[PDB]
Scaffold this active site. Structure first.
Site, mmCIF file in Angstrom:
data_model
loop_
_atom_site.group_PDB
_atom_site.id
_atom_site.type_symbol
_atom_site.label_atom_id
_atom_site.label_comp_id
_atom_site.label_asym_id
_atom_site.label_seq_id
_atom_site.Cartn_x
_atom_site.Cartn_y
_atom_site.Cartn_z
ATOM 1 N N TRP A 65 -9.114 6.513 -0.589
ATOM 2 C CA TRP A 65 -9.387 7.258 -1.809
ATOM 3 C C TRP A 65 -8.450 6.742 -2.891
ATOM 4 O O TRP A 65 -7.473 6.047 -2.614
ATOM 5 C CB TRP A 65 -9.224 8.771 -1.619
ATOM 6 C CG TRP A 65 -7.971 9.172 -0.945
ATOM 7 C CD1 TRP A 65 -6.738 9.349 -1.531
ATOM 8 C CD2 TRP A 65 -7.806 9.466 0.445
ATOM 9 N NE1 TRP A 65 -5.825 9.731 -0.580
ATOM 10 C CE2 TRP A 65 -6.452 9.810 0.640
ATOM 11 C CE3 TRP A 65 -8.669 9.466 1.547
ATOM 12 C CZ2 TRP A 65 -5.940 10.149 1.893
ATOM 13 C CZ3 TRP A 65 -8.160 9.809 2.791
ATOM 14 C CH2 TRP A 65 -6.808 10.141 2.954
ATOM 15 N N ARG A 121 0.058 4.647 2.839
ATOM 16 C CA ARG A 121 0.059 4.390 4.280
ATOM 17 C C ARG A 121 0.380 5.609 5.131
ATOM 18 O O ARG A 121 0.213 5.529 6.355
ATOM 19 C CB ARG A 121 1.036 3.271 4.621
ATOM 20 C CG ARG A 121 0.552 1.907 4.183
ATOM 21 C CD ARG A 121 1.570 0.866 4.540
ATOM 22 N NE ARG A 121 2.623 0.761 3.538
ATOM 23 C CZ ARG A 121 3.773 0.138 3.753
ATOM 24 N NH1 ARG A 121 4.003 -0.421 4.942
ATOM 25 N NH2 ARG A 121 4.688 0.066 2.790
ATOM 26 N N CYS A 138 0.835 -1.199 0.000
ATOM 27 C CA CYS A 138 0.000 0.000 0.000
ATOM 28 C C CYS A 138 0.868 1.246 0.000
ATOM 29 O O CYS A 138 1.623 1.485 0.947
ATOM 30 C CB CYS A 138 -0.941 0.049 1.203
ATOM 31 S SG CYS A 138 -1.821 1.660 1.236
ATOM 32 N N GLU A 196 -4.796 3.833 -10.590
ATOM 33 C CA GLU A 196 -5.612 2.629 -10.486
ATOM 34 C C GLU A 196 -6.743 2.669 -11.505
ATOM 35 O O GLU A 196 -6.984 1.686 -12.218
ATOM 36 C CB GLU A 196 -6.158 2.488 -9.071
ATOM 37 C CG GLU A 196 -5.098 2.454 -7.981
ATOM 38 C CD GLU A 196 -5.769 2.544 -6.595
ATOM 39 O OE1 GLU A 196 -6.297 1.513 -6.146
ATOM 40 O OE2 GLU A 196 -5.804 3.639 -5.991
HETATM 41 C C1 HEM Z 1 -6.294 6.442 2.105
HETATM 42 C C2 HEM Z 1 -5.874 6.395 0.839
HETATM 43 C C3 HEM Z 1 -5.266 5.117 0.209
HETATM 44 C C4 HEM Z 1 -4.588 5.109 -0.951
HETATM 45 C C5 HEM Z 1 -4.280 6.330 -1.847
HETATM 46 C C6 HEM Z 1 -4.177 3.745 -1.209
HETATM 47 C C7 HEM Z 1 -3.462 3.328 -2.308
HETATM 48 C C8 HEM Z 1 -3.243 2.017 -2.661
HETATM 49 C C9 HEM Z 1 -2.883 1.499 -3.965
HETATM 50 C C10 HEM Z 1 -2.664 2.320 -5.258
HETATM 51 C C11 HEM Z 1 -2.767 0.170 -3.876
HETATM 52 C C12 HEM Z 1 -2.408 -0.746 -5.069
HETATM 53 C C13 HEM Z 1 -3.666 -1.437 -5.606
HETATM 54 C C14 HEM Z 1 -3.514 -1.816 -7.065
HETATM 55 O O1 HEM Z 1 -2.944 -1.011 -7.855
HETATM 56 O O2 HEM Z 1 -3.986 -2.919 -7.462
HETATM 57 C C15 HEM Z 1 -3.048 -0.206 -2.495
HETATM 58 C C16 HEM Z 1 -3.040 -1.465 -1.932
HETATM 59 C C17 HEM Z 1 -3.415 -1.828 -0.647
HETATM 60 N N1 HEM Z 1 -4.026 -1.021 0.307
HETATM 61 FE FE1 HEM Z 1 -3.873 1.026 0.279
HETATM 62 N N2 HEM Z 1 -4.648 2.938 -0.171
HETATM 63 C C18 HEM Z 1 -5.324 3.748 0.724
HETATM 64 C C19 HEM Z 1 -5.942 3.307 1.880
HETATM 65 C C20 HEM Z 1 -5.890 2.050 2.435
HETATM 66 C C21 HEM Z 1 -6.578 1.627 3.648
HETATM 67 C C22 HEM Z 1 -7.481 2.596 4.451
HETATM 68 C C23 HEM Z 1 -6.263 0.328 3.867
HETATM 69 C C24 HEM Z 1 -6.696 -0.628 5.004
HETATM 70 C C25 HEM Z 1 -7.468 -0.250 6.030
HETATM 71 C C26 HEM Z 1 -5.368 -0.091 2.790
HETATM 72 C C27 HEM Z 1 -4.819 -1.339 2.616
HETATM 73 C C28 HEM Z 1 -4.229 -1.775 1.449
HETATM 74 C C29 HEM Z 1 -3.732 -3.101 1.199
HETATM 75 C C30 HEM Z 1 -3.775 -4.229 2.253
HETATM 76 C C31 HEM Z 1 -3.235 -3.135 -0.067
HETATM 77 C C32 HEM Z 1 -2.547 -4.272 -0.859
HETATM 78 C C33 HEM Z 1 -3.253 -5.613 -0.930
HETATM 79 C C34 HEM Z 1 -2.174 -6.656 -1.193
HETATM 80 O O3 HEM Z 1 -1.352 -6.942 -0.271
HETATM 81 O O4 HEM Z 1 -2.158 -7.206 -2.321
HETATM 82 N N3 HEM Z 1 -5.173 0.981 1.952
HETATM 83 N N4 HEM Z 1 -3.326 0.950 -1.796
HETATM 84 C C1 LIG Z 2 -6.696 -1.029 -9.336
HETATM 85 N N1 LIG Z 2 -7.413 -0.772 -8.068
HETATM 86 C C2 LIG Z 2 -7.814 -2.060 -7.468
HETATM 87 C C3 LIG Z 2 -7.383 -2.118 -6.013
HETATM 88 C C4 LIG Z 2 -6.869 -3.299 -5.482
HETATM 89 C C5 LIG Z 2 -6.476 -3.349 -4.149
HETATM 90 CL CL1 LIG Z 2 -5.800 -4.871 -3.485
HETATM 91 C C6 LIG Z 2 -6.597 -2.228 -3.328
HETATM 92 C C7 LIG Z 2 -7.103 -1.055 -3.859
HETATM 93 C C8 LIG Z 2 -7.242 0.156 -3.011
HETATM 94 C C9 LIG Z 2 -7.739 0.058 -1.717
HETATM 95 C C10 LIG Z 2 -7.875 1.212 -0.949
HETATM 96 C C11 LIG Z 2 -8.419 1.143 0.460
HETATM 97 C C12 LIG Z 2 -7.502 2.430 -1.490
HETATM 98 C C13 LIG Z 2 -7.006 2.487 -2.794
HETATM 99 N N2 LIG Z 2 -6.649 3.674 -3.327
HETATM 100 N N3 LIG Z 2 -6.883 1.359 -3.525
HETATM 101 C C14 LIG Z 2 -7.506 -1.001 -5.191
#
Ligand code: HEM
Ligand SMILES: CNCc1cc(Cl)cc(-c2cc(C)cc(N)n2)c1
Ligand SMILES: C[C@H](O)[C@H](O)[C@H]1CNc2nc(N)[nH]c(=O)c2N1
Ligand SMILES: [Zn+2]
Length: 416
Positions: free
Chosen positions: A285, A116, A113, A290
């Protein structure tokens, strides 16, 4: 035993000692690196009462060490209390404070993520008193309305009851709460989102009346306490959507694209002190890419590089004319601009990746490290013109954590 990670753009070095507290395994060995395996055998999630207490103790020790009441009487009594309950009940229950800590830190530890820097600003909704799919639908609706906040998006998570036996399992069958439907066509092609074609077919197999279109928001498929899942449609007024326009190309609106503002992952598993929360949807958000890069331009998703480059009038005969690249950038300018002009929260991949370097600096300072998965942190376009490309990142698995878990329809002992 005190590794170093360098930034090659800035010549900054940071010392990672936090990896020493690491518990789980990565998939790599000394002779093979699995850093690009998407769902490694490790990243996926029945327990025993014996396994449960060390995990409880380990979690409780860092929680009390976080309120700087480590090892005190309040800590030792809570250690005893949970020990006893894992004897009495063969499991245990988190205090509300413990739930909020563990959930925030599962995000903090999410090495894939990039967002974070906000980990401590997470709103935790305790749905552990929920008993029915209707109750899940209600908690989720309150989550959507809250986290959406009229486009001023707020980070949130809703935590349904933990796994007990295994055959009683709260699950959101949706991969995200808000997703567009995928319909295969009689000629083989795909309408809507091809990612969800199998899920969309499951919803119809449970009676969903499909408006067979593009951006048809899917119904929630909610399984409560192991029972068969039930369909519910999110009140449309609660699903906020952004129509995509471009700040130069007035033909961009005729593309007829939109996206939902709330990214809300619902298929993953929260782990806190050995307890497993199989239904824990969490939202933040969007980072622009994405939507604009992956959702819109993955070959197996919406795949709009064709039509965008067309209307741009581009040298599309040659691969080397970078017509795909040039139309990918316009698409992401348009996603950003549209979201910002509606006051819906979005971050561009430059601002987000800068925040993550800043966030890394804080984590190496006041924590001793920051587990990070380069393969996932680097944005899917313009990689090396963002500072995370140039930053060495150590991936290791800490707990509390978010894990992947099998899709419920491959595992649910169903009974019609
Ligand atoms: C607040 C704004 C946030 C942004 C901008 C953000 C951004 C991102 C992005 C771009 C990804 C990659 C997903 C993809 O491209 O497929 C990701 C993954 C992830 N996000 Fe964040 N996220 C946010 C909040 C959160 C929150 C609130 C949580 C949990 C409470 C979280 C947990 C995760 C996890 C666990 C993954 C990866 C899943 C894996 O291990 O494959 N995110 N995030
Ligand atoms: C291509 N987007 C698909 C995708 C996959 C995963 Cl595993 C996480 C998120 C995700 C989750 C949260 C909480 C925020 C954020 N900005 N993205 C989006
Ligand atoms: C094969 C590879 O592991 C897979 O494409 C990964 C690569 N990096 C990624 N990074 C992010 N943020 N999201 C993804 O879906 C992926 N996919
Ligand atoms: Zn490796």
């Amino acid at each position: 035993r005190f590794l170093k990670v360098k930034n090659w753009e800035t010549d900054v070095v940071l010392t990672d000692t936090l990896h020493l507290k690491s518990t789980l395994e990565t998939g790599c060995t000394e002779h093979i690196c699995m850093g690009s395996i998407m769902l490694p055998s490790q990243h996926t999630r029945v327990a025993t009462k014996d396994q449960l207490f060390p995990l409880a103790k380990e979690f409780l020790d860092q929680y009390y060490s976080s309120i700087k009441r480590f090892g005190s009487k309040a800590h030792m009594d809570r250690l005893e209390e949970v020990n006893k309950e894992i004897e009495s009940t063969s499991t245990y229950q988190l205090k509300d404070t413990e739930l909020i800590y563990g959930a925030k830190h599962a995000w903090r530890n999410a090495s894939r993520c990039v967002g974070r820097i906000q980990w401590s600003k997470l709103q935790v909704f305790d749905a552990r008193d929920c008993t029915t799919a209707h109750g899940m639908f209600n908690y989720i609706c309150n989550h959507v309305k809250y986290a959406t906040n009229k486009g001023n998006l707020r980070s949130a998570i809703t935590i349904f009851p933990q796994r007990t036996d295994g055959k009683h399992d709260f699950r959101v069958w949706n991969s995200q709460l808000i997703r567009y439907a995928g319909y295969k066509q009689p000629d083989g092609s795909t309408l809507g989102d091809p990612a969800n074609v199998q899920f969309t077919e499951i919803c119809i197999q449970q009676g969903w009346k499909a408006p067979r279109g593009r951006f048809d928001v899917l119904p929630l498929l909610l399984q409560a306490n192991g029972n068969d899942p039930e369909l519910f449609q999110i009140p449309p007024e609660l699903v906020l959507e952004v129509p995509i326009r471009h700040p130069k190309f007035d033909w961009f609106k005729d593309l007829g694209l939109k996206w939902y503002g709330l990214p809300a992952v619902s298929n993953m598993l929260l782990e806190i002190g050995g307890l497993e929360f199989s239904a824990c949807p969490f939202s933040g958000w969007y980072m622009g890419t994405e939507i604009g890069v992956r959702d819109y331009c993955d070959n197996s998703r919406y795949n709009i590089l064709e039509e965008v480059a067309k209307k741009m009038d581009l040298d599309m005969r040659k691969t080397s004319s970078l017509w795909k690249d040039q139309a990918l950038v316009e698409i992401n300018i348009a996603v950003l601009y549209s979201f910002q002009s509606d006051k819906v929260t979005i971050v561009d991949h430059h601002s987000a990746t800068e925040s993550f370097i800043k966030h890394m600096e804080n984590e190496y300072r006041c924590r001793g490290g920051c587990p990070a998965d380069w393969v996932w942190i680097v944005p899917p376009m313009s990689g090396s013109i963002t500072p995370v490309f140039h930053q060495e990142m150590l991936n290791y698995r800490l707990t509390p954590s978010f894990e992947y878990q099998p899709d419920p329809w491959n595992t649910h002992v169903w009974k019609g």
